[PDB]
Amino acid sequence: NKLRLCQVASVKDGEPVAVYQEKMPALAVYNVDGEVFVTDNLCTHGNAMLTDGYQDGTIIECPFHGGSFDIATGAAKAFPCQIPIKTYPVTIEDGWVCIDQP
Ligand code: FES
């Protein structure tokens, strides 16, 4: 069923949270205008973590190359990002950010 990632309270808009859950690839947790989204953290273009880049609303920019993704959709937006980031459907369970065990 569900995997707890981090407390909802820990995720501020503009400051994504790296979560390393033992079943999963590195994960990134975001708050966009008060709502939570979860993506893979490893950039699809290289060896950088998206939680070390720059959130601008629904856009997360990679710390390298100027690449970017849409947090909410997974879309690769700014070049050189081309392969969409994996996203996960999010549930809040008792104050925790959760995703399904996949
Ligand atoms: S490693 Fe993220 S855009 Fe190149």
Numbering used by the authors: 3 to 104
Reproduce text from the manuscript describing this model.
The initial step involved in oxidative hydroxylation of monoaromatic and polyaromatic compounds by the microorganism Sphingobium yanoikuyae strain B1 (B1), previously known as Sphingomonas yanoikuyae strain B1 and Beijerinckia sp. strain B1, is performed by a set of multiple terminal Rieske non-heme iron oxygenases. These enzymes share a single electron donor system consisting of a reductase and a ferredoxin (BPDO-FB1). One of the terminal Rieske oxygenases, biphenyl 2,3-dioxygenase (BPDO-OB1), is responsible for B1's ability to dihydroxylate large aromatic compounds, such as chrysene and benzo[a]pyrene. Rieske oxygenase systems have multiple components whose function is to transfer electrons from NAD(P)H to active molecular oxygen and ultimately oxidize aromatic hydrocarbon substrates.
The asymmetric unit contains two copies of the BPDO-FB1 molecule. The final model contains residues 3 – 104 in chains A and B. The structure has been refined to a resolution of 1.9 Å with a final Rfactor of 19.3% and an Rfree of 24.0%. The structure of the biphenyl dioxygenase system's ferredoxin component, BPDO-FB1, is the fourth Rieske oxygenase ferredoxin structure to be determined and shares significant sequence and structural homology with these proteins. BPDO-FB1 has structural features similar to other ferredoxins including three stacked beta sheets and a solvent exposed Rieske cluster. In addition to the conserved CXH-CXXH motif present in all Rieske ferredoxins, there are two additional conserved residues, Phe-71 and Pro-82, in the dioxygenase ferredoxins. The conserved proline is located at a hairpin turn at the apex of the ferredoxin and has previously been classified as part of a polyproline loop in Rieske ferredoxins. Unlike the biphenyl ferredoxin from LB400, which has three consecutive prolines, this ferredoxin has only a single proline in the loop. BPDO-FB1 is the ideal protein for exploring these effects; unlike the other Rieske oxygenase ferredoxins, this protein contains a residue which hydrogen bonds to the cluster through the side-chain, as opposed to through the main-chain as present in other ferredoxins. Thus substitution of Cys-83 with alanine, valine, or serine, can probe the effect of local charge and hydrogen bonding on the reduction potential. While the Rieske ferredoxin structure is very similar to other Rieske ferredoxins, the differences in amino acid composition near the cluster in BPDO-FB1 provide a unique opportunity among the Rieske oxygenase ferredoxins to examine the effect of cluster environment and hydrogen bonding on reduction potential.
